[model samples]
Each structure stands twice: as structure tokens, then as C-alpha cells.
Target: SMDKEWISKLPKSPEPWTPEQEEAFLKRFAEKVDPEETLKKLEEWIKENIKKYPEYKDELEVAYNSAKLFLESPLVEGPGKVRAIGRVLWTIKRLNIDSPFV
Candidate 1:
């Protein structure tokens, strides 16, 4: 559901999956055991049918700190801090705006 369109601009090289592999997987694990409650809980969080933004605790924190540049803000004192802030901003810009973490 994300924009993987950037990959289209690169050269294609491999088929990560094939029909035979998919069939083999289904036949192998379709019902090999009782459902795992922990896995189910993890997947439920991932699926997040509640239709709201998911929590990304630490990631949001670092991104927030880098964006604010509280300690590095020395526009009047440290010109080098400007370069540091620019790098952090650029790093954050590369991150996908959305997350599946819940």
C-alpha cells in the first residue's frame, strides 16, 4: 500500500517469489499447528484496522529531536551547527512519512 514506484526506476533483476514456491508454502504451513497467539497479536497490531495513525515511539522521538535541533541551534553562535542540522533534516527527509508500527 506504499509507494514502491521508486523501484520501477531501477533495473529489474529477480523474481523474489514464484507460483510454485507460493503453492509449496501454503501446502506446508496452511494448518500445521494451532494458531500462535503471540504471532496473532503482532499481526493484529500490524494490521491496525482501527483506522488511525500508528504509534512509533522512539523513531518519532529522534526525528522530533533532529528536526527541532534544540542543542544544535546556534545560528547566531555556530555556523557548523547549521551543516549538522541540514544533515539531520536530510536524513529525516529520506524516511517514509508513514509507518506500519502500531
Candidate 2:
């Protein structure tokens, strides 16, 4: 018979992941997401970068909001998935902008 403690002794999980890890994992879901994490990331990025890229600011917000609404949408997921992966790749690409000076 299974020990009564077995249920309670489930392996301890690691500490909560930092935002970087969350970003890494979520980037992998470009294939299909039932949730709007992709759009969330974009919205976050846009808010951060809007001042730097004002030309793209409005467009980015529109894209992010549209995707946010449609993530749970009945529409096909492939296009958004591709867009999400591309967005993450572009994000990570620029995220290391200061890595060379270190």
C-alpha cells in the first residue's frame, strides 16, 4: 500500500521563476496559445519601448490589443503564433543590447 506520506511528500518545486525564464518559456508557445501571454508580452514591451520608438508606438499597441482579444478567439491560431515567435525573437535580440560591454 502506498505510504500516507507519499501524497504529502511530492517533490519540492524550484523557487518561482524570474521574468526572464517566464519570457523564455512563453516564447516557445508560438505554435498555439489558448491564453494571451504573447500579447501580454508585446504590450509590456511596447509600454517599455514606446518612448524610444514613437513611430511604432500606436501600431504596437493596436497589434498587442488585437492579439490579446483574439488569443481566446475562435479564429485560427497559426498566424498569431508565428507573429508571437517573431516578436519574442526580436525582443530577445534587442534585450541583450548591453551584453557586449560587460
Off by over 4 Å in 1: 1-57, 67-76, 98-102
Clashing pairs in 1: none
Write the residue-wise lDDT of candidate 2 on 1-102 in tens digits: 653332233566344636696556556654445345545555566677777778556655655655555565656656664564455444444333321111
RMSD of each: 20.3, 16.6
- On lDDT, the leading prediction is 2
Checking candidate 2 for backbone clashes, the offending pairs are: none
Clashes of each: 0, 0
Question: What is the per-residue lDDT of model 1 for residues 2-93, given as tens digits with 9 covering 90 to 100?
Answer: 75443344565254636586455444533242223323442354345223434433443454454345343434444343433333333333
Give lDDT for model 2. Answer: 0.52
